[PDB]
Design a protein around this nucleic acid. Structure first.
Ligand SMILES: Nc1ncnc2c1ncn2[C@@H]1O[C@H](COP(=O)(O)OP(=O)(O)OP(O)(O)=S)[C@@H](O)[C@H]1O
Ligand SMILES: Nc1ncnc2c1ncn2[C@@H]1O[C@H](COP(=O)(O)OP(=O)(O)OP(O)(O)=S)[C@@H](O)[C@H]1O
Ligand SMILES: Nc1nc2c(ncn2[C@@H]2O[C@H](COP(=O)(O)OP(=O)(O)O)[C@@H](O)[C@H]2O)c(=O)[nH]1
Ligand SMILES: [Mg+2]
Ligand SMILES: [Mg+2]
Lengths: 352, 159, 327, 332, 258, 257
DNA sequence: TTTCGGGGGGGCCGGGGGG
DNA sequence: CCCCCCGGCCCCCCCGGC
């Protein structure tokens, strides 16, 4: 197994960064019978899902890690057949309704309600065979839910609080509607510090018997990850595999293919500002989008790569960031992402 | 109080082609057709309340005299006009045998034909073509583009 | 039409083209002589243009006009043609070619071809016109540039309006079903950008590439979802994180070994797959995602056939775990 | 009970338990004797007590037993298409009122009509509301309607005309302090002076958020087990409020006016997970109430903050919006 | 090594059909004692238990207990093609990736032998330790099916109350309410249809209409069905087999008002 | 209870309801000491159904004070389908009732089925619509009327009934052709049930819709004969006589224009 | 391509009636 | 007791501006 997954902590006591958050989670788990609905918001790859699983393991037993995948049927008003993959344990269910796009509402109105409106049979650890505890539902990528699904969650959260408790995870609370935020206890999940990332990487290296010339290499990996611990671990593994498990001070930092393509697009845009350049940029954007690269990620990375160009002056950067804001709003409210990306590229080309 | 009076729009609806105002050339052409018979397949188009239904009804009445009851098949949006209706009832009416003066034919009046679906219009084509020796078709519509091109090719355009 | 696809290569296709006026002038002369009405040969071509080469229509026109008019001369040809002129809905290529023409956007051309006419031209096909405009608005030589305005500025303005039109379209096809905004969309997606970059086409008009790219993206997203839910029990991320972070390391642990130790990596690779409930089809799908300098097509092709055959035999001769039963 | 969150545990049980909605609760209590309850349209910001108020009104109108057969509740979790409105709602509105028992008649007012509560009505389509218009008008004799929403503009004008409007005011430290203090006392929560006022200021009109924050602070204090009063510092920390030192650092970087420094600082800042809305609100408070700025500067910054907040409300990227706002402010 | 030669294969077909809707992947433990199965539903609100004793089979023997993760849909596919009157046998081997189902008949020509793939399902040590059920009863399966079908049209929830000489079934819906109250009934001419009731403490429980409909759908196994209700434990719906039984544990609806 | 009416078998009530369930949706029953009088109107407001059931039809009937129950026919049919046809059927209602209770009791066993159907608020009057002196009144076996209606409906959607001295004419004109059936009064002592009688004051001629007549003929299962009363400027009355009651259909003729 | 609603048209299924 | 007629769901597909 990959080192990122093989060394993931499985308990609150096993956490290694953000000790204050660990103490807060322990306080919340001390008396879980009245735990409110939780909404963990924070940067990607920081450990939000790890901390949610640790909290569940603190509330219930280790059995929370005995997961299984099932497939649930759904029928729309037009009789369309939809499948939803549900990860479940003897104590909780995990769902990602956004997998069904605009149909996510149905999952909220049919599946979740069904969980909250009935009791469950528990033939292990219970003498009577009936569960004497509330069931936990984790909603992944809660920020991807449509407004209809979020609205449907509202009364379900309140009516059946005795039987169901919700734990949602998100990278940004901006798409969450105000009532849902009001109904949840908000938990901020800060990214680990550079020293903590270096400590984790050093522990992994020691466990894997990887030869390291200097610890600074780990530090160099930590900055390149921009606080993303998953990216840090995966990059460490890639670097080790690319140097026969022997890393040196000259070991280059590996970047993913899509990032390289975006950097090349930035260079092309800066160098050439014309309609033919725009057509080539459109081709590159189509290629990036066709391979499951989200449009928002493309816009963010392109904007920051452009702002990192040394030859641009302050006026150009101000115009670029303003256009990025405008077209991020456009993307949030649109269907065809390529249209907005092309518009942003054209505006940037005009400004330069 | 409980006895309604006929509105002037219906009370003074023109009953003869000479009582219709406007579109002098087309009205005179319709009068000539009525006098000499041999009515062709026609599509009358325009905007609301200009005298399309009145003109079609007056032409049919003048042409068919007392044979109006048997020689005219009137269908509009208020009646079912699906593909099955076109294939069965309209086809039977076209295939019907009726005795009329030498210069007259049976008339099918599809008022508000723009509401008909594409399939019914397609089904009407060969029915119009094969039975033209005894049946003629008059469409009245508000938007000519709704009528498919094959039907327009078979008719005379009166805008 | 797509409905006629099954008849592609199971019949001899015989095409009939609109007959020219010279091929029917004698017939019209014979009909006019027999029916006792004067028909000037000069105006015959105008009549054919009116009906767009429909002999049935032109004969019907002659029959209808001869009832009261006994002479079709140059004097009355204009009125008759304008009364009987056909209205054929243009196809997407014709719509794109006409909308991007710079003449219609000039003052005089605006007087002849009006804004209502442009909106009707869009409505001739309201599901493909915006796509065609978005596809072809970057491949013209504008003749409507304002004093000092460059081609790039007009292109940027057109792109901004296309983005606004996309937002309007999202509004239209929402749960509210706001189809009353269809006219507005026509202006924002087709008419305004075309007016901004109207002129002469620099090259061949191309059909929209958005549909094929959208279908390809949907297919790749489906493959990504299957791969993610096959490995969901071992990883900690969403599908996007799997695409952006995990797949490079998975390649380094699944593809690179075959390029260094040849057939000695097989077992190791299999082990990795067994650790994540992966399969051969997932292997190929994962190898099909990378772009830029990480394209594997040539790399996979260059692998010796013996190594791939051995990998297939080893996989097919061993039992593997199942993450999801009855997917 | 001990197995319920404080928000649900302390939900009002009767109209007298509503804290700061007297302008409407008085009329609702009057209707008990008047027995001519009109069609109601409750609207207001989140967590003001609309659902609690309607539930308490039904409780006091029909009592625990007769309520089930007299109330029809539909919310966003239920399908409410035009067909549903035209069939199910119409059929329920056409039914005769259930017969009260002797107990109910002698112990409760038992008005001669039933109630349909369409909670979160702003999520319903316009066609469904149009269908509801004449259904409410025709059967007013035996049925009354309650529409609860957050955005009143989403209700079609005919329905708003048919309904009597009730605006639920925002709950702040001035009108809701008593309820929070009562909850804290009943829970034996030890807090320093001004802690409850600070909680209500942070909640910004939402009493549910304030109660949840109080419960979180109480849990933290109990886990600590130090027997010390809860301070405002941990209350601010639990609410996600940025520390004042960080805000001053951001203000200084903005005053510097260098694009690169601002970009680097914002990149470092976004790694802490602070929500963009809280940062924007704190910046607005700092700048608008500062005496070291001219009228023109405040005039421009108010519009800049309004634009940034409107963009953020659409679910945009927090990093880009915050960087754009800070860059624009630095150039004022 | 392992075989369960049946008196009539139709019995096995009905047994498999009786719980196909509730569960689809169930582990069957074949021992010399018989066939055992215990599967929890996907929603963790219903449990299906199956027991087929050695006596029921015409000729059953086992040399080593074997757990087969046979799929129910594939088993139904195998059994549907079989003839009306056969002697289904379940032969397997030491390392079975498939089990050969021999559909043998008295005649040497009416044979429908097939093969059925076996899946690898994970099985846990489910415990069904007996509990002091408050009140139990047994009534003909046809009557239960009629009651459930009639009451489902009214509402999706059905309430069962056991009181002194009273078995109350209630279905309250939007259009109205229905009740089919029955009392202890004994027939001397045909005791087989008599209603049996042993009541210890009062019980009132609400169940989902869909689950009850699914349970009664598999009532062809026996002309009688037994219901055991405990105030603090899930109900139990039992259909006696020739030498075992098919049992269902259903979790009652959460009582929000309580 | 306020009202308690017992049917020896639920079959009779089921057949009575099935006689007019396909033409109307909402019905209002007024129960008094003399029996039950019910009225219903179709959606198009073209047909009116009036049912009367006397006390003689019930094994035991008791109604202390008049009570009005407004119900929806499809729900009533759905409820009735849940009870067996061989069980005694008791209709029970209370003062100012909110629901009607249907009790299906099987004396053979201890099976009792209680079904509560919620009433709907319907404030309407019966108007006791019955013209005093109709222009013409005839009666004939229900089978003949049903056969004639079925035969003529196949040709046209409209059927014309003309009554003249010793002549009853049913005419239909359609696209494929026309049909005409002429019947004269006749009496047979051997089988009087097959006789048709007519009494005419003025000649009559009225056009009706075929669909409504097709719905009306469904009542032939309740009576062997049918009586038709026709008058100009008044709706046509089709009556089927029951053992101790009646079923009447008032059908408005089409406008002559 | 497509997030509802309406409309049209075809294929079954099954109640009832007839022989 | 079996076969045929013809009402009702059930499903699939296609517009939706002036
Ligand atoms: N040319 C006309 N001369 C006299 N009366 C007319 C004329 N046109 C319309 N009317 C009057 O308006 C009434 C309606 O005329 P119609 O023939 O129904 O118009 P229409 O164009 O067919 O309406 P549409 O296209 O179905 S909305 C007639 O009864 C006449 O009384
Ligand atoms: N006026 C109030 N008085 C007392 N408690 C209140 C009041 N308003 C809100 N609360 C508290 O917050 C909780 C939620 O109140 P709600 O009635 O759900 O507010 P709401 O306005 O209906 O929320 P929305 O509009 O659906 S986001 C209650 O259980 C109370 O504990
Ligand atoms: N040693 C250590 N690793 C952690 C910790 N938290 C997260 N990680 C690692 O970081 C990886 C990503 O964490 P994850 O929760 O999936 O990211 P998120 O859900 O996007 O916030 C995990 O696979 C862990 O290996 C921690 O507290 N200690
Ligand atoms: Mg007209
Ligand atoms: Mg509320």
């Amino acid at each position: 197994s990959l080192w990122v997954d093989k060394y993931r902590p499985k308990s609150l006591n096993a956490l290694s960064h953000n000790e204050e958050l660990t103490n807060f989670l322990k306080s919340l788990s001390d008396q879980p019978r009245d735990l409110p609905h939780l909404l963990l918001y924070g940067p990607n790859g920081t450990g939000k899902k790890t901390r949610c699983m640790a909290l569940l393991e603190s509330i219930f037993g280790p059995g929370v890690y005995r997961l299984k995948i099932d497939v649930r049927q759904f029928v729309t008003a037009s009789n369309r057949k939809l499948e939803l993959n549900v990860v479940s344990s003897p104590y909780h269910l995990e769902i990602t309704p956004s997998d069904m796009g605009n149909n996510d509402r149905i999952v909220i109105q049919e599946l979740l309600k069904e969980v909250a409106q009935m009791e469950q049979v528990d033939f292990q650890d219970s003498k009577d065979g009936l569960a004497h505890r509330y069931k936990c539902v984790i909603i992944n990528e809660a920020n991807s839910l449509t407004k209809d699904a979020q609205a449907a969650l509202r009364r379900t959260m309140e009516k059946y609080s005795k039987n169901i408790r919700l734990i949602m995870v998100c990278d940004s609370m901006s798409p969450i509607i105000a009532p849902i935020k009001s109904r949840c206890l908000l938990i901020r999940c800060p990214a680990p510090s550079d020293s903590e990332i270096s400590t984790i990487l050093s522990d992994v290296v020691t466990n894997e018997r990887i030869q390291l010339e200097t610890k600074d290499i780990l530090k160099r990996i930590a900055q390149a990850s921009n606080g993303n611990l998953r990216v840090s671990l995966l990059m460490l593994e890639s670097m080790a595999l690319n140097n026969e498990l022997a890393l040196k001070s000259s070991s280059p930092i590996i970047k993913p293919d899509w990032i390289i393509v975006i950097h090349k697009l930035t260079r092309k845009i800066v160098k050439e500002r014309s309609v033919n350049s725009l057509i080539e940029c459109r081709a590159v954007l189509y290629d990036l989008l066709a391979h499951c690269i989200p449009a928002n990620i493309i816009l963010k990375e392109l904007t920051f790569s452009l702002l990192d160009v040394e030859t641009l002056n302050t006026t150009n950067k101000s115009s670029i960031i303003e256009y990025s804001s405008v077209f991020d709003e456009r993307l949030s409210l649109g269907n065809k992402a390529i249209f907005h990306l092309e518009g942003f590229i054209a505006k940037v080309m005009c400004c330069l | 109080t409980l006895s309604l009076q006929l509105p002037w729009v219906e009370k003074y609806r023109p009953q003869v082609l000479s009582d219709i105002v406007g579109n002098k050339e087309t009205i005179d052409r319709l009068q000539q057709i009525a006098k000499d018979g041999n009515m062709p397949h026609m599509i009358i188009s325009g905007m609301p309340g200009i005298g399309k239904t009145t003109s079609v009804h007056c032409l049919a009445h003048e042409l068919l005299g007392r044979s109006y009851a048997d020689g005219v098949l009137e269908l509009n949006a208020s009646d079912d006009r699906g593909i099955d209706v076109v294939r069965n009832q309209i086809k039977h009416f076209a295939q019907k045998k009726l005795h009329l003066p030498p210069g007259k034919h049976k008339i099918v009046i599809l008022d508000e034909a723009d509401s008909m679906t594409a399939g019914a219009q397609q089904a009407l084509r060969r029915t119009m073509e094969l039975y033209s020796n005894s049946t003629r078709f008059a469409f009245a519509c508000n938007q000519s583009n709704k009528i498919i091109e094959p039907l327009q090719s078979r008719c005379a355009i009166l805008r | 039409l797509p409905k006629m696809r099954p008849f592609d290569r199971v019949c001899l296709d015989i095409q009939f083209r609109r007959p020219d006026a010279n091929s029917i002038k004698s017939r019209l002369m014979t009909i006019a002589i027999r029916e006792k009405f004067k028909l000037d040969p000069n105006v015959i071509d105008r009549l054919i243009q009116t009906t767009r080469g429909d002999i049935r229509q032109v004969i019907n026109l002659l029959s209808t006009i001869s009832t009261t008019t006994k002479t079709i001369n140059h004097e009355n040809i204009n009125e008759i043609s304008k009364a009987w002129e056909k209205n054929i809905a243009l196809k997407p290529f014709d719509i794109a070619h006409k909308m991007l023409d710079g003449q219609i956007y000039s003052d005089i051309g605006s007087r002849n071809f009006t804004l209502n006419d442009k909106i009707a031209l869009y409505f001739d096909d309201f599901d493909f016109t915006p796509l065609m405009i978005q596809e072809n608005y970057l491949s013209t030589r504008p003749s409507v540039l304002k004093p000092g305005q460059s081609h790039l500025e007009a292109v940027a303005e057109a792109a901004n309006c296309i983005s606004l039109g996309d937002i309007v379209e999202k509004k239209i096809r929402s749960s509210e079903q706001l189809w009353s905004l269809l006219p507005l969309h026509a202006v924002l997606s087709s008419v305004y950008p075309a007016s901004k970059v109207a002129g002469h086409m620099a090259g061949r008009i191309n059909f929209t590439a958005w549909l094929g790219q959208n279908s390809k993206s949907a297919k790749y997203y489906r493959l990504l979802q299957e791969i993610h839910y096959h490995t969901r029990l071992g990883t900690s991320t969403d599908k996007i994180g799997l695409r952006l972070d995990y797949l490079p390391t998975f390649r380094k642990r699944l593809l690179d070994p075959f390029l260094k130790q040849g057939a000695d990596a097989i077992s190791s690779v299999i082990e990795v797959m067994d650790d994540y409930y992966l399969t051969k089809e997932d292997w190929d799908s994962i190898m099909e995602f990378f772009v830029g300098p990480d394209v594997t097509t040539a790399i996979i092709k260059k692998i010796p056939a013996t190594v791939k055959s051995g990998f297939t035999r080893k996989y097919n001769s061993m039992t593997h775990p199942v993450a999801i039963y009855r997917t | 009970l001990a197995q319920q969150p404080w928000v649900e545990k302390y939900r009002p049980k009767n109209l007298d338990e509503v804290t700061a909605q007297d302008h409407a609760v008085t009329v609702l209590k009057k209707t008990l004797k008047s027995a001519n309850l009109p069609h109601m349209l409750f609207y207001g910001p989140p967590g003001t007590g609309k659902t609690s108020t309607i539930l308490a009104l039904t409780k006091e109108l029909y009592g625990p037993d007769l309520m089930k057969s007299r109330i029809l509740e539909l919310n966003a979790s239920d399908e409410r298409g035009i067909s549903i409105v035209r069939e199910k709602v119409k059929n329920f509105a056409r039914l005769t009122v259930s017969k009260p028992s002797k107990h109910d008649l002698e112990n409760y007012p038992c008005p001669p009509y039933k109630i349909i509560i369409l909670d979160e009505a702003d999520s319903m389509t316009a066609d469904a509301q149009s269908a509801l218009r004449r259904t409410m008008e025709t059967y007013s004799g035996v049925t009354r309607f309650c529409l609860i929403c957050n955005y009143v503009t989403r209700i079609i004008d005919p329905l708003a005309s048919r309904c009597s409007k009730f605006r639920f005011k925002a709950l702040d430290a001035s009108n809701a302090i008593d309820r929070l203090r009562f909850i804290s006392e009943q829970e034996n929560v030890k807090c320093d002076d001004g802690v409850l006022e600070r909680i209500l200021d942070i909640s910004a009109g939402d009493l549910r958020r304030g109660i949840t924050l109080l419960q979180s602070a109480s849990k933290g204090a109990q886990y600590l087990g130090d027997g010390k009063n809860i301070t405002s510092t941990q209350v601010e920390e639990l609410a996600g409020v940025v520390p004042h030192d960080i805000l001053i650092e951001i203000v200084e970087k903005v005053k510097s006016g260098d694009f690169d420094e601002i970009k680097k600082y914002v990149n470092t800042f976004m790694k802490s997970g602070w929500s963009a809305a809280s940062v924007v609100n704190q910046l607005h408070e700092y700048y608008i109430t500062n005496d070291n700025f001219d009228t023109n500067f405040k005039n421009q910054i108010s519009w800049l903050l309004f634009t940034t907040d409107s963009r953020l409300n659409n679910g945009t990227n927090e990093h880009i919006q915050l960087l754009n706002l800070l860059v624009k402010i630095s150039q004022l | 090594m392992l075989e369960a030669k049946f008196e009539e294969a139709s019995l096995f077909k009905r047994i498999i059909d009786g719980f196909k809707d509730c569960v689809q992947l169930v582990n069957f433990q074949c021992k010399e004692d018989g066939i055992i199965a215990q599967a929890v539903d996907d929603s963790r609100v219903l449990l299906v238990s199956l027991e087929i004793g050695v006596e029921a089979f015409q000729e059953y023997r086992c040399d080593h207990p074997v757990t087969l993760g046979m799929d129910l849909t594939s088993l139904s596919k195998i059994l549907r093609c079989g003839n009306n009157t056969d002697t289904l046998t379940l032969i397997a081997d030491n390392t079975p990736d498939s089990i050969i189902l021999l559909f043998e008949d008295t005649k040497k020509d009416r044979i429908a032998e097939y093969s059925l793939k076996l899946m690898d399902i994970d099985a846990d040590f489910l415990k069904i330790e007996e509990l002091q059920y408050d009140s139990t009863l047994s009534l003909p399966s046809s009557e239960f099916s009629k009651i459930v079908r009639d009451l489902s049209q009214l509402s999706d929830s059905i309430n069962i109350m056991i009181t002194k000489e009273t078995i109350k079934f209630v279905a309250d819906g939007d259009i109205g309410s229905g009740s089919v109250i029955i009392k202890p009934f004994v027939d001397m001419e045909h005791p087989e249809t008599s209603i049996k009731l042993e009541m210890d403490q009062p019980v009132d429980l609400t169940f989902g209409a869909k689950y009850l409909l699914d349970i009664i759908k598999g009532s062809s196994l026996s002309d009688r069905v037994g219901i055991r209700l405990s105030s603090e434990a899930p109900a139990l719906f039992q259909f006696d087999l020739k030498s075992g039984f098919l049992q269902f544990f259903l979790a009652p609806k959460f009582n929000d008002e309580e």
